[PDB]
Amino acid sequence: EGFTGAPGEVKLITLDPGHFHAALVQKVSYPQVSKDVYVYAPTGFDVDEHLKRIQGFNTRAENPTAWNEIVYTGDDYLEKMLAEKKGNVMIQAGNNGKKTEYIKKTLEAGINVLSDKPMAINSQSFKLLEECFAIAKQKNIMLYDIMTERNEITTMLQRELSTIPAVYGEQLKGSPEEPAIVKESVHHLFKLVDNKPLTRPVWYLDVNQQGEGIVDVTTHLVDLVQWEAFPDQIIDYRKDIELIDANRWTTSISPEEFKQVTGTDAYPDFLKKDVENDTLKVYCNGDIVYKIKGVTAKVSVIWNYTFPKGGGDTHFSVMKGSKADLVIRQGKEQNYQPELFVEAVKGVDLAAYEKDLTASMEKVSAEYPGVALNKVGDGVWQVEIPAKYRVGHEAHFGQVTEHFLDYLKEGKLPDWEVPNMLAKYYTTTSALDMAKAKT
Description:
Name: hypothetical protein
PDB class: oxidoreductase
Entry title: Crystal structure of a putative oxidoreductase (PARMER_00841) from Parabacteroides merdae ATCC 43184 at 2.23 A resolution
Order of helices and strands: EHEHEHEHEHEHHEHHHEHEEEEEHEEHH
Number of domains: 2
Assembly: monomeric
Keywords: NAD-binding Rossmann fold (PF01408), putative oxidoreductase C terminal domain (PF16490), Structural Genomics, Joint Center for Structural Genomics, jcsg, Protein Structure Initiative, PSI-biology, oxidoreductase
C-alpha cells in the first residue's frame, strides 16, 4: 500500500547525518512519522552530534518529541541499511561528496528520499543525479530537496508582486553587462548562539566533501530566480539555460580560526592540499552569470569567517520589471532582517503609478493581511510586513518537510519540481566547470 496520511506510516532512516538539518526534520512530531527511527552511520563526531540533537528534542520543556533512535554504527553502515530496509523515507544531510551515491542506492532499494541541498556538487555528480530522478520515476518514489527560502516572507511577496503587471510590468531580460535579476549573499562560517560557539565538522572546509561555494548556497539563489521570476514554469535545462560567466575564490582561515570554528587542531590531514603558509584557503566563494529563458541573472555567495559585533549575514537583490524594480535590502540599516522595496523605473507617470499601486495592494493585503506600503522617497515604497510573518528558518524548514510528507500521499510532486531541480543543479555544476576553466 502507498501513503494515505495514516499515523506512523512514514518510517525514517537517517543516513550518515553530518548537519543540523538531519535532526531538524525531527524537530516536531508529525503524526505520519513513526516514532521508531533507523540511524546508520560511521562511528564518530557527526552521528554523536546528531543523536544529541534528537535527545534534546525528546527532553525539552514544551511539546517534547518521543523519538526512538535505533542506531547502527560501523564501517558497513550503508551496506547494513540497504540490507535491512527498515524504513521507507531516507533523510540525507551532511557530507555532500558522498551524498549523490547514497541517494542513488537508496532509490534503487525503493526508498523515498528527502535530501538537504546540494544534491550534486559537480558535473559528474549531476549526471548521477539525473539517473536518481530516472530511478525515482521508474519506481514511483520521490526524490526531493529542501528549498527553505521559498517560505520566507519577503521572497513570497517578491514573487507575488512580480506577477502583478500594474506593479511590476513585464520581466526585463537585461544583459551580461547589466543583469535583470541579481542576488548577492554574504554568510559567515563562525557565529555565536547564546554565547556558545556554533561548531562545524572538519570536512565542511574541504570543498571536495562540502562542495565549493559556487555550488552550495547558490542552490538557494538559483532556485529563487526560477521560483520568483518564472512561477510554476517548467525550465528545460537543455534549452533554457546558457551560462555566461562564473568565478570562484577563496577565504583564508588562520590556524586559530580553524580551531575555533571546528574544535579540531589545525589542520586535519585531508585539508593539507588547501593549506599554504599555515593558512587554509577554502573555495567557499563564487558567483554565476547566466541566461534563463533569455533573462540574464546573476547570483553570488561570499563566506567570511565572522562578522564584527553589531553585524551579521547580508543580502541584496534586484529583479527588474518594465515598470519597477523589486529590491531586497538586508544590511546594517535593516538590522540584518530582509526588507522589500518597490522602486519605479525613471521616466514613468509617478502619479498614475501610485494609484495602480494602491489598487494592487488591496489584492496583496487579501493574500497577506497586515501588509501595506510606505512611501520612503519619491518612486520608492517599502513593503511594510507585520512581525508575525517573521517565522524564522526552522519554521521555513518545517513547512518544506510538511510539504514533502503531503506529497508522499499522492506519490507525485507537481509538474515543475523535478525538471526545475535539475535545471537548478545544471546551472550550479556547469558554473563550477566554467569557473575552473579560467584558472
